[PDB]
Write a protein that binds this ligand. Structure first.
Ligand SMILES: Cc1cc2nc3c(=O)[nH]c(=O)nc-3n(C[C@H](O)[C@H](O)[C@H](O)COP(=O)(O)OP(=O)(O)OC[C@H]3O[C@@H](n4cnc5c(N)ncnc54)[C@H](O)[C@@H]3O)c2cc1C
Ligand SMILES: [Cl-]
Length: 469
């Protein structure tokens, strides 16, 4: 009984289709893009060309909704990288000591992750993916949405798709503002923090002995310094390749050419470790850039009038600067918020409004983590009403900077630090007396003077060829 229509077949659309199919009779996914039969790039997801980090918070939710996805991803060549044991990060406060595993992350190409999730989601026959179809209008009125009017691209014909619930997961380019204006409702309050961050990505062939078991390598900017923030990340992906992403805010954007790419990885960031590593490897692709790095939040939950049976989640409601890697995990938490409101209110009046408020809560942690670090950079453009970002930004920063500094050299503080940053625990977990006691206990290890690389890791950066003696 009952039917749902999900707009957009990306990450959030697939995950919320898996969830909705367990609560309604049929789910119809509407997308304007063409979908490949294998782990391929497509025009509807241009961000798949760049490095994608799936934190434990998102991966655990994906595993719950689609059991077997993690093992399937690992079987295809993905890497399970422990945190912080398997990471080499020059943090804003110094090198992070590689304590034993507290959290984890999944490392694969975004194309492989999207194809794997879609294959598992579409095993349920009651979910239908309708490709290359435009979204014309929402059916119903400003009091209740009753479906969507769509148009096939090949024919141009228009049809009505009825639904008891319409979920918008069309991503950053969501047309929900227009779709709502044609419904008569005003525009939602728009919050954004624009640092001008620009991505630049190249693919590399890892040295043979390092195709397996290699750590995530990241060189971070110092968000407290008054210089443009530049980052460099090296992430192993399937099939023995390395995806290398460099980034910079306004006034320090990475170049588009191959020559300048390696120079940026060596001298554009605070430590040349990534630049040193890529020169052990064969480049495979040219530089591809992205400018989709604005933290943007649409407050649909606070509109005076909100229609029944209409829900927005994913990048359509809250997008973030990707250098913090919370986008996919935030959408996963949003899907669970909707699932929580379905278990509580079923399809009674008030579900859509209650779902929109829980979705706003579910993304607030990722929003704060991204925007609190982005506002400091030179040339930043901010439009906000949040006192955390405005009035109380100085006091909140003096505490996180103290937490972050201690987290590089204290295991229990690091435990809470990575639990929050992987979106596996809430903000309140940082106020537990057992964490603030460890912050007051100070460091338990010396600040590393070198990249905390393991000797067996660096040994696998060379073939060992040409030696017979
Ligand atoms: C460069 C970059 C790097 C990132 N790195 C990370 C990372 O490491 N970790 C992380 O967690 N997140 C990362 N993100 C964020 C993550 O990619 C997004 O948050 C995530 O894709 C959100 O899922 P979504 O389904 O809402 O959007 P998408 O995955 O983009 O899905 C959009 C879908 O809707 C369709 N669509 C779009 N417009 C319309 C329309 N008008 N009508 C119909 N269909 C439409 C598209 O064809 C597509 O299928 C990164 C983003 C970028 C740009
Ligand atoms: Cl992009």
């Amino acid at each position: 009984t009952r039917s749902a229509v999900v707009l957009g077949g990306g990450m959030a659309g697939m995950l919320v289709s898996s969830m909705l199919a367990r609560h309604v009779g049929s789910v119809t996914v509407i997308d304007r893009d063409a979908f490949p039969a294998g782990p391929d790039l497509r025009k509807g997801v241009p961000q798949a060309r760049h490095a994608h980090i799936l934190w434990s918070g998102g991966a655990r939710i994906v595993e719950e909704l689609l059991p077997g996805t993690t093992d399937r991803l690992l079987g295809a060549g993905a890497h399970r990288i422990g945190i912080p044991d398997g990471q080499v990060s020059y943090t804003a406060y110094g090198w992070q000591h590689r304590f034993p595993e507290a959290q984890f992350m999944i490392a694969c190409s975004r194309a492989l992750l999207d194809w794997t999730v879609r294959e598992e989601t579409l095993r349920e026959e009651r979910i239908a993916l309708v490709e290359k179809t435009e979204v014309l209008a929402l059916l119903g009125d400003a009091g209740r949405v009753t479906g969507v009017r769509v148009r096939d691209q090949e024919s141009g014909e228009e049809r009505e798709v009825p639904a008891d619930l319409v979920v918008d997961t069309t991503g950053r380019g969501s047309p929900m503002k227009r779709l709502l204006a044609e419904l008569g409702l005003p525009a939602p309050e728009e919050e954004f923090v624009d640092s001008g961050m620009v991505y630049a990505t190249r693919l590399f062939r890892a040295p043979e002995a390092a195709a397996t078991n290699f750590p995530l390598v990241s060189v971070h900017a110092d968000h407290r310094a008054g210089r443009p923030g530049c980052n460099a990340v090296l992430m192993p992906i399937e099939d023995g390749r390395w995806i290398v992403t460099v980034s910079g805010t306004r006034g320090g954007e990475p170049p588009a050419d191959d020559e300048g790419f390696a120079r940026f990885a060596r001298d554009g960031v605070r430590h040349p470790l990534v630049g040193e590593l890529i020169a052990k490897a064969q480049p495979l692709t040219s530089v591809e850039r992205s400018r989709s790095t604005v933290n943007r939040r649409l407050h649909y939950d606070r509109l005076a009038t909100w229609p029944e049976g209409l829900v927005v989640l994913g990048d359509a409601v809250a997008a973030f600067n990707p250098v913090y890697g919370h986008g996919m995990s935030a959408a996963a938490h949003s899907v669970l918020a909707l699932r929580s409101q379905l278990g509580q209110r079923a399809f009674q009046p008030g579900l859509a409004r209650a779902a929109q408020r829980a979705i706003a809560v579910a993304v607030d942690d990722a929003w704060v983590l991204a925007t609190s670090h982005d506002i400091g950079y030179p040339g930043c453009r901010t439009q906000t009403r949040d006192p955390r970002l405005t009035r109380h930004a100085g006091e909140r920063q003096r505490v996180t900077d103290l937490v972050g500094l201690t987290a590089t050299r204290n295991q229990v503080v690091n435990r809470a630090a990575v639990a929050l940053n992987t979106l596996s625990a809430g903000m309140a977990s940082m106020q537990d007396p057992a964490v603030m006691a460890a912050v007051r206990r100070g460091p338990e290890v010396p600040a590393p003077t070198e990249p905390p690389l393991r000797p067996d890791e660096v040994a696998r950066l060379v073939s060992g060829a040409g030696v017979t003696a």
